[PDB]
Amino acid sequence: YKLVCYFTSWSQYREGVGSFLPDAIQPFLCTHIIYSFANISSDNMLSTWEWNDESNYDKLNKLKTRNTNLKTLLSVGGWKFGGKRFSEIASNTERRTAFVRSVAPFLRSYGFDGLDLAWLYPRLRDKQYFSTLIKELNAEFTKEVQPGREKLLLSAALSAGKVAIDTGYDIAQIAQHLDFINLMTYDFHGVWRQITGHHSPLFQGQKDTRFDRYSNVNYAVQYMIRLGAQASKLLMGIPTFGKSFTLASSENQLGAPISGEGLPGRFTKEAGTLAYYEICDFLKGAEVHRLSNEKVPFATKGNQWVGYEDKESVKNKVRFLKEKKLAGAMVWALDLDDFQGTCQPKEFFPLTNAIKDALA
Amino acid sequence: YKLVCYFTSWSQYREGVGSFLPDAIQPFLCTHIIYSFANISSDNMLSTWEWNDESNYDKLNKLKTRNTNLKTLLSVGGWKFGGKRFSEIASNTERRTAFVRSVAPFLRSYGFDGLDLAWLYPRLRDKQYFSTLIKELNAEFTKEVQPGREKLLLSAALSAGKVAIDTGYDIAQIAQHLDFINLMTYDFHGVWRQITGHHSPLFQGQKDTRFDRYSNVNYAVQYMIRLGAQASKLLMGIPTFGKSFTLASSENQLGAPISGEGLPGRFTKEAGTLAYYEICDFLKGAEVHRLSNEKVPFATKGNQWVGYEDKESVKNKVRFLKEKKLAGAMVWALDLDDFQGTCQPKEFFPLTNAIKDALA
Amino acid sequence: SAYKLVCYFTSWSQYREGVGSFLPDAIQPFLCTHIIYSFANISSDNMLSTWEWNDESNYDKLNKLKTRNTNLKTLLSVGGWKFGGKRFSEIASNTERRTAFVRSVAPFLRSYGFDGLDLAWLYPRLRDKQYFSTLIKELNAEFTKEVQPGREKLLLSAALSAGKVAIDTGYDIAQIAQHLDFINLMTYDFHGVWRQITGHHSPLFQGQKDTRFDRYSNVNYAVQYMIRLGAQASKLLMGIPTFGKSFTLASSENQLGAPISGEGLPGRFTKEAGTLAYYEICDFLKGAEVHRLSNEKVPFATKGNQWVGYEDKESVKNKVRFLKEKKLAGAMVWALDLDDFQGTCQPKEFFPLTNAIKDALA
């Protein structure tokens, strides 16, 4: 089984104990570590994003001297990068070719073992170009490998939303040219629903609305397989973060009315999002409810409501992905796990280690 | 009568059924269609904003082959663009001249019939420069007529807020050089009021302050006329969108207390704003109330409250603009109308078509 | 002793609607001893530069004040929150880039008639601490090398956090205090919305403590802590805000520590949820209840589900009395554009809060 772990560059800028650097990662935690995100220069070439990315690349590859089988990948794109730019590059043969050719020298220069594609998200007019890009990256990596080196890995972060998949992805085509698929099986329940909901339920709940039937881990996985992704290619995404809501009234059950995003956490400073280490604090004095159908916990206290992942639900999701014979787990993200052991004494990365243990 | 219809470039990026492209426009819906927004390059020259604006210019002008009387305009500026850049350009003779000269070749190259000025918004130090810019554009369009030409049209989006008008506009001066004025008679009630209010009331309601009397369609129209805008130049802005609030308590009347913006819609994803196609969804299970004085509806459901436009209120506003002998209606925006017939089986553009029918 | 009244104002305040628009020529020339312009940028060539296209003309409106008060000092503040820490980390940690900046400072200031530089690195983290020190030292040295007959040495100040953790993380206080003419202590904005309860953002002292409110987040602790860490009282300026921090209440409970549903509703002119200028607070108080904290020595105001902790004349005067007892160099004010600079609150009372501070310093 693969355990593919994302972490973010911007997590370094959080205050105090929230600041995350790659040298805080246990070298044997993950099989693959992905650095998010790289940019693309105006000359259409893969490049760093922050002024100091090189030094973090160095801190990341120094890990591989302590675990020589550890693989690192660089993720290009991300939400901030936007779809517009990828549409601009991929749909133009010269811009796309400049990028494809720019990828491998960069990765080798900084000691990376592969590229992760984070085009969030291709629209209908981009679908085929998306395919082409992947093919052309795969071809290029095939043409680039030499003796003494291992062929560059190619992965892609794909949406777990049915509509996004139908709109953007030619699944059967791209799955053949990707070493693995990072399935983003989380963040399923936006605040536009106007009710509380868990953002990463394993199965559908008691309700059977249009939005309810598709927005769960099981449907996304089975749908990806039905569309021609190989189970051996699929990595099931598991979040370390919770999605939160401010309650409109005393009702705090699943489906209760909300007045907006949850109050931001002290360190992540993003309304509606909580890192696991912020959730640990939140749980003191809170009610934890375990969803029978969805197999995941939410916790509530005062007018705050957060759906999240703990050790148990993470282990159960690993059991699910094993029954489905998936390639393993993908984790977003290490910097949102309790990486410093704040929650429990000397338990570093409790969620990711729980995933690793359940995979063994 | 003119029916001048705005649509936005960024509406193309909305998910699913929300994605809007100009080829979805019925060619006989509007007399004029305005593309928002164009940018200005660092060399002070009119330019595209998105990498693919050119292809949407094509989608838009190919409409004129199906309705040869249709006029298109390109709107430069917009809220994101900001006032600063316009202050920098307009107050400097060289930069302003570079822009002014750049406009006509650009518009002709892409098949546009005119330019719309969307300086949101000029402050006191800009007022005269604003005038100058308009004059110099008009002069240039006067100088540019050819054999197979119609003179380029020049319009401007002007605020309907009294203070913005007194601060930024020399109305009597600029009205002489503008073919029409797109009066932004909507978005009158910011969340700073701390109570619910309709964002486009036709007349003032029962409540009185100082800016209660000014913040309605009637006052803005009559004020623009009193300041020397010609009724034949004034287009009365009519919104296809609602402005929404989250209610602080069970009180849901006009003037009820709020805790913030309304919850965002699924497709528009902007707290406080709902497209008409999202409002149709919202009305299912909601109570609709029609304001007697203000002549417009608001709807309430749970802790959500939205003031909006429907067929009836839109028709009544057309009747109003006819009594005042205005040049016609301006619509913001086509992408916020139910352009795909989600509300009622293939009734495309119900609000805009209601306006068109009411002009006859 | 003699006291400094150091007053910040912001460049972006000019862009606010209507009566909220602020330009430096609205400043009374004798209000303040020092006026600080926020913020300057740093060009990609690592050189001090303007931020807005029209900064030069506002520099002129600002120095035109000094002809009417010839003892008035102006400083240009570089950095700010929008500027971010990343850029300062990039510049300060590299000897070539840092030297280019240091050398660029003085010619710029002289070109535009400024009497000094204010450093607004918000905020240096642990790996930046020493580089921060070096930068300050190297600026001071450079200003020392730049003085000639007929001119007075450039002033060097720094905006420093009043938060304990930020201070421990970023600042070598005893070292940098020796190379700074004064420290602008940011003794405000103490209570972020992440607390999930109401709190005053600039309490003078700790209140009747429950576990939710820490010991550190008040003016007294920050001042005494800075002194304990080797800042000289004669170097410390105690920051006093003209703005309030606001919350939307989750329920009818409206006292200190009450539950909230988010930031306060934005003001009409400042347009920033959670923040209200004093002139917006004046309007807000109409129909509101004003509550005065006994221990914290500051007011909060309540109306409907809105809750705002702020400063009025009384609390500002009392804070000046406090800073005098501690023998501080004087007061720092953030910010003039957030004071009632046009006299909206009371007829012909321009800058009521800052003038209250000035009067109390005399």
Swiss-Prot record, chain C:
Q: Where in the cell is it found?
A: Secreted, Extracellular space; Cytoplasm; Endoplasmic reticulum
Q: Which GO terms describe its molecular function?
A: chitin binding
Q: Which Gene3D superfamilies match?
A: 3.10.50.10, Glycosidases
Important for AKT1 activation and IL8 production: region residues: 306-320
A GO cellular component annotation here is: cytoplasm
**Glycosylated position list:** N41
UniProt note on tissues of expression:
Detected in lung in pulmonary macrophages and alveolar type 2 cells and in bronchoalveolar lavage (BAL) fluids. Expressed in mammary tumor cells (at protein level). Expressed in lung. Not detected in non-inflammatory colon.
Q: Which family does it belong to?
A: Belongs to the glycosyl hydrolase 18 family.
Please give the PANTHER family that the UniProt record associates with this protein.
Answer: CHITINASE, CHITINASE-3-LIKE PROTEIN 1
Descriptive protein name: Chitinase-3-like protein 1
Identify the species of origin. Answer: Mus musculus (Mouse)
Q: What is the lineage of its organism?
A: Eukaryota, Metazoa, Chordata, Craniata, Vertebrata
